[PDB]
Design an enzyme around this catalytic site. Sequence first.
Site, short mmCIF file in Angstrom:
data_model
loop_
_atom_site.label_atom_id
_atom_site.label_comp_id
_atom_site.label_asym_id
_atom_site.label_seq_id
_atom_site.Cartn_x
_atom_site.Cartn_y
_atom_site.Cartn_z
N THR E 1 0.89 -1.25 0.00
CA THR E 1 0.00 0.00 0.00
C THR E 1 0.86 1.21 0.00
O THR E 1 1.54 1.59 0.94
CB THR E 1 -0.93 -0.09 1.20
N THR E 2 0.87 1.74 -1.24
CA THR E 2 1.81 2.69 -1.68
C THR E 2 1.37 3.57 -2.86
O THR E 2 0.56 3.11 -3.65
CB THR E 2 3.19 2.03 -1.96
N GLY E 47 -3.73 3.44 1.99
CA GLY E 47 -4.44 3.11 3.14
C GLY E 47 -5.76 2.50 2.68
O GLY E 47 -5.75 2.06 1.58
N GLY E 130 2.79 6.00 2.18
CA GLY E 130 2.68 4.52 2.37
C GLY E 130 3.76 4.05 3.25
O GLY E 130 4.09 4.67 4.25
#
Lengths: 202, 202, 202, 202, 202, 202, 202, 202, 202, 202
Positions: E1-2, E47, E130
Amino acid sequence: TTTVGLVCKDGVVMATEKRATMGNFIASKAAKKIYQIADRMAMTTAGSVGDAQFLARIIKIEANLYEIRRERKPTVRAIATLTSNLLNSYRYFPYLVQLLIGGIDSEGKSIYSIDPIGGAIEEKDIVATGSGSLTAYGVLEDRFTPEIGVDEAVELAVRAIYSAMKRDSASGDGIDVVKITEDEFYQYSPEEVEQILAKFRK
Amino acid sequence: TTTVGLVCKDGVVMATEKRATMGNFIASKAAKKIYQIADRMAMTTAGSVGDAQFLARIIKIEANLYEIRRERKPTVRAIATLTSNLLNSYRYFPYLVQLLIGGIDSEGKSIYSIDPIGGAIEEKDIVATGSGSLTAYGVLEDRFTPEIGVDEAVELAVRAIYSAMKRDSASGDGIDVVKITEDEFYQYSPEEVEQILAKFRK
Amino acid sequence: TTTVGLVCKDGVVMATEKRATMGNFIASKAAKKIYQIADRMAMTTAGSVGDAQFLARIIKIEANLYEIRRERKPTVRAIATLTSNLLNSYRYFPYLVQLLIGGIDSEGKSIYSIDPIGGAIEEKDIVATGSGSLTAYGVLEDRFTPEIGVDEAVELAVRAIYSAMKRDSASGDGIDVVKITEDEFYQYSPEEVEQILAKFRK
Amino acid sequence: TTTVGLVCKDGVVMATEKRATMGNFIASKAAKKIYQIADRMAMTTAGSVGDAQFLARIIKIEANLYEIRRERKPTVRAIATLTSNLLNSYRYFPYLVQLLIGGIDSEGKSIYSIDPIGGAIEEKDIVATGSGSLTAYGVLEDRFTPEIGVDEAVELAVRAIYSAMKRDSASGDGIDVVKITEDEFYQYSPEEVEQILAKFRK
Amino acid sequence: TTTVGLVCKDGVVMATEKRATMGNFIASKAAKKIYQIADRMAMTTAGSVGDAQFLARIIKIEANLYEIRRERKPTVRAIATLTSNLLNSYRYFPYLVQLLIGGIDSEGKSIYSIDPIGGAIEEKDIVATGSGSLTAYGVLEDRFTPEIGVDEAVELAVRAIYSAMKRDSASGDGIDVVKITEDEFYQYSPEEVEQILAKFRK
Amino acid sequence: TTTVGLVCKDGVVMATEKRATMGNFIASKAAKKIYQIADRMAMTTAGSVGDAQFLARIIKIEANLYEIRRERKPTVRAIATLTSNLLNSYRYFPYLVQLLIGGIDSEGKSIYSIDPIGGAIEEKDIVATGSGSLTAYGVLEDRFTPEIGVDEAVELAVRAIYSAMKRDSASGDGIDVVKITEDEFYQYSPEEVEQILAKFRK
Amino acid sequence: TTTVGLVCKDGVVMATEKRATMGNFIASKAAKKIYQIADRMAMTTAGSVGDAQFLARIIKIEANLYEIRRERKPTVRAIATLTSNLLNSYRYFPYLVQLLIGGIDSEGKSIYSIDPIGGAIEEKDIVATGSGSLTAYGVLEDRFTPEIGVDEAVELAVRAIYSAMKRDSASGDGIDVVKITEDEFYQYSPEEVEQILAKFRK
Amino acid sequence: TTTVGLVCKDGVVMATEKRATMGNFIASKAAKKIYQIADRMAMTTAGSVGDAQFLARIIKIEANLYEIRRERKPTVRAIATLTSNLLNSYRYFPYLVQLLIGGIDSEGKSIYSIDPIGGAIEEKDIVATGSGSLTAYGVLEDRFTPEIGVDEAVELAVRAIYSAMKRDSASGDGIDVVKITEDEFYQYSPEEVEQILAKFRK
Amino acid sequence: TTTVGLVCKDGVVMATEKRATMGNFIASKAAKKIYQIADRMAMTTAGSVGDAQFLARIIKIEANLYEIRRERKPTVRAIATLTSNLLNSYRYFPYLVQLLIGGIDSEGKSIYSIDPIGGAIEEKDIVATGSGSLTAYGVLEDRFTPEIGVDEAVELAVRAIYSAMKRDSASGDGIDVVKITEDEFYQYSPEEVEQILAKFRK
Amino acid sequence: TTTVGLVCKDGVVMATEKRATMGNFIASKAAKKIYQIADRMAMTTAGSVGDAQFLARIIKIEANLYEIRRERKPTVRAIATLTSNLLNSYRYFPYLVQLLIGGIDSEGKSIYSIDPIGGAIEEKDIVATGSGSLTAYGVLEDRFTPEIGVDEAVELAVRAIYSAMKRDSASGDGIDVVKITEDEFYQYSPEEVEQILAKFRK
C-alpha cells in the site's frame, strides 16, 4: 516458496521455487532447495532453508551408505522411512519444512511426503504443499491424465507454480524444475525454467 | 551493521559495517567484524558482537586444524559444512549471527553464507546478509559481472554499505573491507568515505 | 555505574566508580569494583555488584596459576579469552557484568571488553563499560590524543565519570581513579579525587 | 526530533531537524518545521510532525487575529500562554508534542517552552527538549555566551543537533534553522545550512 | 500500500495501485483508488479504499461549492488545507489513511500530502506516501529534472511504484496513472499501463 | 525480620530480631535470626525465613571442620568466600537471601555482605539488610565514627532498630543485641534492649 | 520529587526539589515550582514543572479576582479549599499532583496540604508530601522550633532538600526557596540558593 | 487449618482440627493431620492434606530407624533437622506443608517449625502454622503460664482452634487434642472435645 | 484502614486509625481524619483518605444547610441517608469509603454505617466496617457492656485499633477518638491518646 | 449469600443471611438485608450488600407513591415489575442483586425472583435463589404442602439456610427469618433463629 511433485510413466518430475521473497525482503535467492540424494533420487523442500539444508546432508549420506552396505540401490520408501524416525525423534527442536522425496528406483516410482511433525504418506500421483499450496494443487488436478509423462509433467509443473506467483506475495519469481527421465538427472536451473513462462506474457 | 559478499573472477571481495551497541553499553569504531579464518579466507559477521566473536575463535581453530591434518590449503566448502553443523549443536547455546565464510580455495572461488539456524546459502551471485540487506541488494545487482575487477568489487561494496548508512544514523557507522585477490588484504577504512564529504560543501 | 580504561603512552589508566546502593539502602562504600589480576594488570567492572565481585576471584586464580605454570606474567589477550570462555559455558544463568580488561604486559598493552555471553571486543581506546557509558564516552573522545600521559588520563577520566554520575544515581558519591604507570598501581582513593570536582562544581 | 533555542543579542536562533511522516523518512528536501506565526514570532517543535503543523495553524490564526483586532503587535509571552490554554483544552484530541515558541517583542527577547500537559514557563536563553536533548544540551551550555550573535548562534544550533543525530537513529538528515534578526524573518533554507554543517567532516 | 507523485513543469503526475494489497488477496477485480476532486485536481490515496473514498467525495463536494461561490477556481492549496481540517474531525472519529492532493491552480502547480494526524506539506516535486514509499522516493530522484515533460513523467511514475511490486506479483497487474496537463484530466486505465510495463516485462 | 551490623573499633556488634514475621503473617513467635558460625563469628540473615534457618547449620559445620583440620580458626574472609560458592550454586533455583557474616579475626574486625548470586564485599562501615534497613541506616550513620566503641554501638543499634519497629507491623519484634566483645560472646537478650527503648512506655 | 515546608514565627518558608519528567531530560535551570498565588502567598507543587505552571495560573487569577471583589485579601485557607474543588471536579483535565499552598494571612500563618483527590488539611508545622519526605525529616524536624525565624527557616529548607539529594549521587538538582515575611516576597533563583548549599558542601 | 503445639511443664500438648472443607463442600468428615512419629513424639500439620500424610509416613519410619540403628530415643532436634534436609532437597517436587514436631525426650521439650522451603530451628513456645493462626495466637499467649499443666493446657489448645473456627468454618464438627505426658500418648478423639463447646447450644 | 464505633449509655464514641503511610509520605503530620459535621455530629471514615477529606466538606455544609433551612436540628438518620445518594453519584472515580456517621438526635443515641455505594444501617451497639473489623469485634465485646461511661469508652476504642495496627499494613501510635455526650464535642488527638495506650504496654 | 421463599395458605415466609462474611470482613453483625417495602410485603436479597440496600430504599418510596396515587395497596405483581424496569433502565449504575419480592396482596400469595440483570419470573410456591440454591430446594420440598402453616414454615426455612451456611467457610452464623402472616411483620433476628438450628444441633 511452493513445491509440487508428479508421478510420471517414465520417471519423476518435481519442482521447487528456488527464489522466495516475503515483501521486498529476499528470504531466498539462489538458495539450495533442490538436492541430489542419489543418482535418480531427489529431494525438493518448501519451508525454511535452515532445516532443509542440514537435513538434506544426512539423507544424502544414508542413501550413499545404503548402496555401499547392502549392494542394492535404495528405494524412496527406505530413505523416506529413515527420515521420518529422525523428525519424530528430534522433535525436541521443531522443524518447519515439508519434504518431498521421490525419484526412480528399481521397484518403480513412488513419491512420499514427510511432514514437519513426522510420518510418511504415499502420494498417488499429485501433491502441492508449501505457502502456495492450494493455488498450486488445482491446476495439477485439472490437467491430470494418468498417461502423464515427463513431457506433460514438466509443463504441468511450471503452470501450477506460475499461478501461485500471481496469486501470492509470499512466492518468488525464480522457479526451478528437476527432471528425472530414468536416463538423466537433469536440473533445468532457474533461468531456463523462467524463460519458458516469460513468453506467456509477464 | 551489515555485511555484503561478491565473488570475482580473480578472487573474492567482502566488506563489513562496524559500531557495536549492546543496549546502552556502547563501543568505539574499532570493533572487528572481520576475522581471518584462513590466510586467504575471511569471515565477515553481522548480528550480535557477543555471539560472533565466540564462534570466530572456534572456526579459526577448525581451519588451522584442517590445514595441518589433511596437508592442504583450507577450503570454503569444508568450513561451511562444519559451521552449519556446528550451529545446530550449539543451537541449544543459541548463537544469533549471519556469516559469510568464503574466499579463495583449491576448488576455486566461492562463498557459502551460513544462517544462524544452520542454513547455507549458495553464493557466487549476490547475497545480503545483514540488516542492510534491502539496501545492499540495490547496489550489488545494479552493477555486476562475473568478470568484475577486485578494485570494482570494493567500490561496489562501499557504495552498497553507503546506502545502509542512510538508514543507520547510530546503529552502524564505519566501513572496513576484505580484499582477497590471493595476494593482498586491504582495508578501505572509515576515513576514505568521510573525507569526500569534507570536500563537499553539501 | 560506568568504568573506563584507556591506553596511555606510558601505561594504562583505569577509573572506577565507588559506592553503590541496593534498594533504598547504601550497601557499598568499601567494596572494590577494581581488581588487581596481577600487579600491573587490572580489571574494572560495571554492572551488578554480586556478579562482578564473584567473577573477579575466578580471573585472579587463573592469573596466579599462569605465573606458576608458564613462568610468565599473563598478556591482556590471554586473560580476556579466559573471561569470555567462563561466561559462555554458564550461559544458563548468565553473569550480568560488562568487563574491561586492560593492563600492561610483556607484549605491550591492549584493552579487550568482554560482552555478557562471551565474545571479546579488542578495542584500542575510547572505551567505557557501563550504561553511564554514553555520557562518559563523549568527554573521553574529545580530549584523548594517541599520546597522552598518565597524569592527564586520570584528569580526563575523572571528568568522564563526573559527567556521567549526574544522570545516574547508581555510580554513587565518591569517584576513584587509578594510575597504572608501569612501576606502580596507585589508587588515589575517593578522598583526593573528590577535590578535582572542586575545580568543577560540587 | 530534538530542538534547541538560543536567545541572542542580535536576534533569536531556533532550530529543528528534518523528519516527516511518509514511513518515518524525510519529505522532499524541505519539510515543514518552521511556521511564521507572526512577523517577529516563530515556532519550532520537537515531537510529532503532523501535530506540529496542525497546532501551528490554530496559534497562527489567533496571533494574526490578535494583531488585527487590537491595533497593537503581540508579544512573545502572549502567544506562549495562548498556546497553553489551547493545548490543555484540546487534549481530548490525541496530541503530544513539546513546543518552542520564541521570538522578539517589545519587552525584549525570550523563548517560552510549552508542554502539552503544562503551561508556558519562561526559558531565559537555554532550552532542551527532545529525545536527543541530553546530547544537544551538553554542548550547548559550554559554547553559550549570553553575548552570542546570530552568526555564532547558527553554528551552535546546527552542531548541537548534529551531535544528537549521532546517538539516535530517529533523527533524519538535514537541519533547518530560523533567524529573527529583529527586522527580517529569515529561513536560511536546506541549501545554505548544509555549508554551515559541512565546515566539519559531514 | 503505496502511492507516488512528481510535480511536472507542465502538469502534475501521480500514480496509485488499482488493487489494494492484502499481501495474498485483492479487493475486487476492478477497483478505483484514484479520485477526481475537480477538473484539474485529483486525489490519490494510500491506506483503506473504504475510508479514502468517503473523505474524497466530501472534499469534492465542498470544492465545487467553493468554486461556485467565488465564481473562480479554488487553489490546490485550499483543497489540501480543507482535508487537513476534515481529517482532524476524523481524528476525533479515527481513520488511518494517507492522502495526496495535487493539481493545477492559479498560483502554479504542486502536490500536498495530508496526513490523518493533521497538517499539510508542500512537496516540492518528489513524493510518496505509504510504507514502500522509501524505495519509490529513491527511483523518483533518478531521472528527475525540472526539464521533464508530462509524457516522461508518467514513465517515471511507473518506475517508482514498480519498485514495491518488483518482488511481488499478485498486484503486479493493476495500476493507475493520473496526469493533468491542463487540457486533459486523464487516467490511463490498466491496459495503457500494461504496455508501459510490458517493456520491463513483469 | 530486619538485621543490622557494623564494625566497631574493639569488636563487631550485630543486632537481631528474635521473632519472625512475613508481613502480617506470624511465622513463629520465637525465632533466632542469630547463628554462631564459630566461637566469635556469627551471622545474621534477612530475607526468607525458611532459607535463613536452613542455611545456618551448613555454614557452621564447615567452619568447625576448618578448625579441626588445620588446628587454627578460619578467618572471616575464608568463611565469607566459601559461603559465596554455595549461594552461587543455589542461585539456579529461588534462594533470595542477604547474609551478614562477620566477627573478629587476626586481619582486624570485619563484616562481609554476601549476595544471593554470590560475591562477598566487605563493609568496614555500616550495612543494613531487611525491610527495616532504611530507617536503621538513618540513625546508624549519624553518630558513626571509625573510633566507635562496642559500648556506644550497643546504644546506637537500639535506636536504629526502634525506628523500623514502632512505625510498622511489617517488622519483627523483640530486640536482641549480640556483642562480640572479642574475649566473649555476649547476648544481651530480648528483654534488656526493649527496656532500653522503653522511654515512651512504662 | 518532594516539596517540604515549615512554618515560622514571623513568616512562612517553603522549598522545592525540582525534576522534570520526560524520562529523557531534566529541566530545572530556567523553570521553577514556586508560583506566587497572591502578592504574599505562594504555592509549591510536586510532579512536573509544566503541570505546576498550568495548574498554578488558574489559581493565581482567582486569588486576584477575589481580592478585588471583597476589597480585602484572601486568606491561605480560602485559596487552599478552592484548589481542592478544582482538582476533584475538573479532572476532565486529569491531574496527579500534590500541592502546598501556604503563606501569610490575616488569621495567622500556615501551610495547607491539598491532595490530588482534594481535601485541605493544615500543617501548622512540618509537611511533605513527595517520596523524599522521610529523608527530609531527619534534619528538618529535629532542629524545628516554634521559634524558627524566617532566616533560620531558609537555612533549614536548604538542609532538608540537600538531605533528600544526598541519597542520589547528585540527581534531581534544582533548589528554589520562597521567603514570605510580609515585608518581602523573595522568589529565589538557583544561583542564590546555591551559595547557602555551599556552606554544607562546597 | 491451624495447628497448635505448646509446652507443658510435665508434658507437651499439641492439638489438631478435623473436618476438611472447600467452602462449598465437606470434603472429608475426618482428615489425618495427627501422627505418632515416636511414642512420645507428635507431628501435627497445618497446610496441604496430601503432602502432609505422605510426609508423615517417611519421618515415622526414619524415626524408627533411629531407635533401631542408634539404640537411643529420637530427640526432637534430631527428627526436626533430618526432616528439613528432605523438604529442602525436594522443594521443587510438590510440597507446601508446615510441620510442628514436638514432644518430650531426653533432650527435653522444644518445638520446631519446619518450612517446605527449608526451615530448621526452634520456638521456645507457641506456634501457628495455620491460617486461623492470628486469632489462635492471641488466646494462646494470654493464658500461657510456664507451669501450665496438661489439664490447663488442653483447654487452651481447644480455645485456640475455636478462635480459628469462628474466623473460617472448618474446625467445627470435630477438634482432636493429644496429651503427651511422658508416660502416655492419649488421643482425645474428635467427639469428646467437640461436646464441651456444643453444650452452649441447647 | 479501620474504624470502630460504639454507642454508650449517654454518648457515642468513634475512633479512626492514623500515623501510617499514605501515597509514600507519613500520613499523620497534622491531618484531619474525624470530621465535624455538626456540633453534635461527626463522621469517621475507613477507605480512601483524601476522598473522605473532600466529601466531609460537602456533608458538613449540608448539615449546616439542613439546620439553617428547616429550624430543626439534623437527625443521625438524616445525614447517613444523604451520604448514600452522594456515594451513588461518585461511583466512577476513587471514592470508595465506608463511613460511620454518629451523634445524638431526638431519636436517642446512634451510629449508622454507610456502605460504599450507599446504604444506611442502624446499630445501637458496636460496629466495625474495615479489614480491622474481626479483630475489633473481639477486643470490643470483652469489657463492652450495654451500659458503659463516655470516658470508659475512649479507653476501649483506643485499644482495639492498636491491636488492629498489627493486622494492618501500617499505622502508628496516637489516633483520633471523639466523644459526643450531649454536653461536649471533645476530640482528644494524638498527644492525649498516646497516654491511654501507655497503660496498654507494647 | 442465599434466600429462600415459600408461599403459605395465610403467609409468605422468606429468609436471608443477616451476617455476610467474605474473607475477614463483616459488614456489621446487625446488618440489615431484610427490607420492608410495604405493610405486608418483604424483600430478601442475596448478592452484594451495598447495592441491595441502595436500590431497596427506592422501592419502599415507590410502594408508598403508587399506594397514594391509586388510593389502593400495591400488588405483589406491581413491585416485581417495577424493580425489573428500574434495574434495566439503571445498568449504567448496575446493581448486582437478586431480589425476591413477595408478601400478601388482594391477588393473594406469590413470590417473584428478579434477576440482577432485570426481568420478573413467577414461582409457584417454592423458590431458592443464590449459590446455596441446589441443596436448599430438596431440603425445602420434604415437608412442604401448600397448606403448611406459618409455624411450620419458619422452621422449614431455617433448614435450607442452615445447610448452605455450615459446609461454607463464607458463612456459619447470622440468619433472619421473616414472617408475614397477614397480621404481623416479625423479624426473628439471629438469637431467636439460633434455637431453631440448635434443635438440629451441630
